[PDB]
Amino acid sequence: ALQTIINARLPGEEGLWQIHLQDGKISAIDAQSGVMPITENSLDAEQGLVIPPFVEPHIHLDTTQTAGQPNWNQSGTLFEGIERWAERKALLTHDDVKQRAWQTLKWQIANGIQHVRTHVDVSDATLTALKAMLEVKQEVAPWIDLQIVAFPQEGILSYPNGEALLEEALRLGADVVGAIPHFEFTREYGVESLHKTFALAQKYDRLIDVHCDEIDDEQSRFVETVAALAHHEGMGARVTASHTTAMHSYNGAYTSRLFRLLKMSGINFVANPLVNIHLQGRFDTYPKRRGITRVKEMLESGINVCFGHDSVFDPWYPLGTANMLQVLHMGLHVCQLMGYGQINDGLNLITHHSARTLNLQDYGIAAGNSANLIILPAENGFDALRRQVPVRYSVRGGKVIASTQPAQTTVYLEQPEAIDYKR
Amino acid sequence: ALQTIINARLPGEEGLWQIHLQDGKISAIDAQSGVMPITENSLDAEQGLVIPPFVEPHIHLDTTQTAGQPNWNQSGTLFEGIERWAERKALLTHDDVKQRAWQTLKWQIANGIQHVRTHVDVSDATLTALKAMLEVKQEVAPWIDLQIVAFPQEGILSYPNGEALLEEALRLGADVVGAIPHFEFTREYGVESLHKTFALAQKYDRLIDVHCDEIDDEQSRFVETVAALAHHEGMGARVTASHTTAMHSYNGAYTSRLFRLLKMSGINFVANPLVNIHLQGRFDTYPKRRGITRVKEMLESGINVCFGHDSVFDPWYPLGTANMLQVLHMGLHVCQLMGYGQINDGLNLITHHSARTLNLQDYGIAAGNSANLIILPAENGFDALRRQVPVRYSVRGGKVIASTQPAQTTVYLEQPEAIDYKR
Ligand SMILES: [Fe+3]
Ligand SMILES: [Fe+3]
Numbered sequence: 001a002l003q004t005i006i007n008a009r010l011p012g013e014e015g016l017w018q019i020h021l022q023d024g025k026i027s028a029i030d031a032q033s034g035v036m037p038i039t040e041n042s043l044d045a046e047q048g049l050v051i052p053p054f055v056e057p058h059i060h061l062d063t064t065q066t067a068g069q070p071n072w073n074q075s076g077t078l079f080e081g082i083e084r085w086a087e088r089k090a091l092l093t094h095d096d097v098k099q100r101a102w103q104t105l106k107w108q109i110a111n112g113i114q115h116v117r118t119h120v121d122v123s124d125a126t127l128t129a130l131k132a133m134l135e136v137k138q139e140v141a142p143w144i145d146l147q148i149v150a151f152p153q154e155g156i157l158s159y160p161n162g163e164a165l166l167e168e169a170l171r172l173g174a175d176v177v178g179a180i181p182h183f184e185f186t187r188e189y190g191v192e193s194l195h196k197t198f199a200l201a202q203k204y205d206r207l208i209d210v211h212c213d214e215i216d217d218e219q220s221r222f223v224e225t226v227a228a229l230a231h232h233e234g235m236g237a238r239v240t241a242s243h244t245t246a247m248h249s250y251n252g253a254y255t256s257r258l259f260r261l262l263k264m265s266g267i268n269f270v271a272n273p274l275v276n277i278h279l280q281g282r283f284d285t286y287p288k289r290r291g292i293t294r295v296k297e298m299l300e301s302g303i304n305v306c307f308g309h310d311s312v313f314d315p316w317y318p319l320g321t322a323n324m325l326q327v328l329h330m331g332l333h334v335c336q337l338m339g340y341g342q343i344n345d346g347l348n349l350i351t352h353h354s355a356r357t358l359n360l361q362d363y364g365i366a367a368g369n370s371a372n373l374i375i376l377p378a379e380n381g382f383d384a385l386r387r388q389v390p391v392r393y394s395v396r397g398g399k400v401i402a403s404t405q406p407a408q409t410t411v412y413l414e415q416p417e418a419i420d421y422k423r
Numbered sequence: 424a425l426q427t428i429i430n431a432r433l434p435g436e437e438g439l440w441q442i443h444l445q446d447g448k449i450s451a452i453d454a455q456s457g458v459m460p461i462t463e464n465s466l467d468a469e470q471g472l473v474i475p476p477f478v479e480p481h482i483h484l485d486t487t488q489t490a491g492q493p494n495w496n497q498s499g500t501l502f503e504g505i506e507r508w509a510e511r512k513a514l515l516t517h518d519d520v521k522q523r524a525w526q527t528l529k530w531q532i533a534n535g536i537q538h539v540r541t542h543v544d545v546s547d548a549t550l551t552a553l554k555a556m557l558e559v560k561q562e563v564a565p566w567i568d569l570q571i572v573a574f575p576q577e578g579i580l581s582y583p584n585g586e587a588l589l590e591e592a593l594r595l596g597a598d599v600v601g602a603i604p605h606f607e608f609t610r611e612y613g614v615e616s617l618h619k620t621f622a623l624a625q626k627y628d629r630l631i632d633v634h635c636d637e638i639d640d641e642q643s644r645f646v647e648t649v650a651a652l653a654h655h656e657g658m659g660a661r662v663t664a665s666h667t668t669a670m671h672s673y674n675g676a677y678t679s680r681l682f683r684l685l686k687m688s689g690i691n692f693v694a695n696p697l698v699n700i701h702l703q704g705r706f707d708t709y710p711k712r713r714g715i716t717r718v719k720e721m722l723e724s725g726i727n728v729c730f731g732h733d734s735v736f737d738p739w740y741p742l743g744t745a746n747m748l749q750v751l752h753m754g755l756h757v758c759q760l761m762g763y764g765q766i767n768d769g770l771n772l773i774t775h776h777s778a779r780t781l782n783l784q785d786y787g788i789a790a791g792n793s794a795n796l797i798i799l800p801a802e803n804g805f806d807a808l809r810r811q812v813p814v815r816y817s818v819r820g821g822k823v824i825a826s827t828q829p830a831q832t833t834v835y836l837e838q839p840e841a842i843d844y845k846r
């Protein structure tokens with residue numbers, strides 16, 4: 001079994017480091033004064049970057065891999081997506097959900113993702129997708145720690161038996177309580193739905209992740225209730241507000257007042273760049289707003305924010321290979337986090353900040369933690385992002401669970417020359 | 424020497440095709456009714472997609488590869504970029520320009536790009552970068568047909584001897600006449616500069632490519648003069664309006680009136696997604712406009728529009744590997760061209776439409792044309808874009824000039840499994 005990771009670079013640290021492993025955990029981390037020789041039981045990072053695993057804080061595994069079945073979304077709109085999904089209803093079975101979820105999970109394992117939070121639609125009396133996902137969670141456990149959010153997609157108060165079904169999902173084992181206040185019939189139902197969500201989270205000791213203000217409506221302010229209730233209950237660390245795309249459209253004075261509460265509350269925020277740029281701004285003609293939440297300002301204020309993929313290869317988002325560096329690339333561009341340090345520090349948005357969002361208790365390259373880490377064939381976060389590098393090795397419990405042999409590119413000039421896209 | 428390309432898929436065509444080669448040209452293209460066996464002198468596309476070469480219609484090779492020299496742009500702003508470039512002035516020499524241009528050109532060769540249009544700053548009495556680029560053009564000719572635009576970055580009428588220097592650049596061999604009307608001191612200088620640009624293009628029989636309305640100013644309408652002058656001279660095919668980001672901010676009534684002229688004029692448009700999303704919208708607070716020209720509407724109206732990378736690894740854009748599928752990916756998201764057909768047809772924005780922008784006379788998989796083509800390990804444009812596939816083989820004059828051995832990814836579950844990100 002592997003005993004050491006050598007010649008590793010660490011974000012924010014100078015030089016090379018050696019990570020000692022024992023009994024599936026990291027026993028010690030020591031600085032090197034030069035390059036160490038390889039040997040039996042040593043995994044050579046080759047001066048590449050070593051980081052804790054990538055994290056997917058927001059994905060819908062119940063709908064993944066269904067694009068084009070039975071028909072393709074040709075307009076690309078949300079409206080048509082709903083119609084295309086409806087045409088596939090006859091194929092939505094226990095086994096179908098498990099097969100598709102596992103296909104995307106394998107791409108995630110290949111991409112160094114060891115922690116995933118999936119929302120599962122529980123606005124279904126049969127709870128078909130939820131029952132399937134609970135089995136998938138157990139099956140994939142050796143490779144990925146999967147959290148399941150009971151997501152009442154059609155609303156809690158605006159759908160028949162919505163609250164009873166949400167609670168049933170928690171009784172069956174869902175890890176997180178979801179909500180979608182802006183989709184409820186009225187603002188009052190929206191606010192009330194959040195009180196019910198928090199009461200359920202406290203009753204069952206579960207986390208909360210709300211699809212919050214995902215709409216280009218400057219009056220959609222459910223985020224202040226999410227933060228206020230979290231502050232009142234002293235549970236900010238266990239609470240997440242996903243999307244908050246309406247914040248992109250708020251006036252600055254209200255946003256400034258709100259930020260004081262967001263910081264005090266300690267809640268987490270998830271932005272989903274690939275999907276937000278695609279589905280937001282659809283009611284504008286020109287100019288067209290970007291529609292991503294205030295990521296740059298959150299970072300400047302010390303508010304925890306991170307990035308999710310949201311959807312993969314389905315009616316709502318036809319693209320994706322479940323790659324977090326690709327999600328990060330889009331977010332840095334749309335949010336204009338394009339200075340060198342902003343890009344280099346970008347890795348935090350898909351590693352540490354996401355681990356905090358999932359309330360993980362065993363995460364990070366530190367002595368005593370499980371030996372879960374990945375190796376990128378790049379010098380730092382900037383280099384990894386610019387070249388969109390694959391994950392050379394993914395290690396979990398001190399064992400290799402994925403590896404990618406890099407592509408090899410050659411140009412035939414006066415003589416053959418290898419191209420690695422470095423200067 | 425290669426005599427045939429077999430088992431090729433072609434955009435918009437059903438089945439597999441065989442492309443016969445002779446004397447460096449395509450002699451014939453025949454449909455196959457099944458998979459053909461490989462043999463000596465046959466390049467097997469393996470049911471991958473075969474297309475004419477990728478094209479880079481807009482890049483600045485004179486500034487490429489300089490990010491972080493001597494310092495990094497930390498804010499990511501245009502203003503700081505200008506300052507960082509100024510700090511590198513002592514290093515700007517003939518040999519330095521050639522070395523950096525060649526580094527990016529090699530990445531382009533590796534990425535299947537055989538046609539490149541580079542703008543070169545000619546607001547320099549010594550014309551240092553231009554002299555260097557003219558040598559690079561000759562040196563790279565066996566692999567890339569490089570067009571050089573004499574770009575008067577500081578203006579034609581607003582910079583000392585601007586017009587004389589622009590003409591000197593044409594006398595030295597620049598292929599295209601540039602301009603930048605919105606940067607001139609006054610609207611009147613802007614309009615006058617375009618009359619001078621067109622007069623020079625007609626005097627020397629050169630193409631035109633204007634940095635046109637690259638500003639979030641709803642009153643920047645130099646594009647109507649570019650189109651009107653092209654229509655008057657009957658030379659639309661030889662004219663390009665780059666950026667036109669101001670169009671993102673025009674009212675709809677004026678845009679509708681303008682579109683009639685744009686179509687009638689026959690001029691070309693270049694949008695630069697990676698740079699436009701980064702540098703446009705910088706004066707907005709929230710909401711923030713996207714700032715890309717009206718690509719979707721141009722396509723719907725039959726107006727030729729295509730995508731360029733603009734900058735690679737420099738103070739104005741720190742990222743990039745000169746990859747056109749990456750440029751396309753950003754453009755499809757920001758322009759909301761996310762329906763299946765829109766994405767699949769996306770390849771046109773980085774192949775055929777760009778060839779038209781460069782007024783190329785030998786381009787396309789057709790009998791009689793030079794055997795210049797590339798092979799993508801994907802089923803169609805959608806698949807190539809989704810998986811961001813590399814160029815398996817680039818063929819020029821019937822000879823392989825670049826090849827990429829794909830990466831190999833494995834996940835170690837109960838048994839090892841190869842992952843190719845296909846469902
Ligand atoms: Fe979601
Ligand atoms: Fe330019």
Ligand SMILES: [Mg+2]
Binds near residue numbers: 310
């Ligand atoms: Mg959604």
Ligand SMILES: [Mg+2]
Binds near residue numbers: 733
């Ligand atoms: Mg520019």
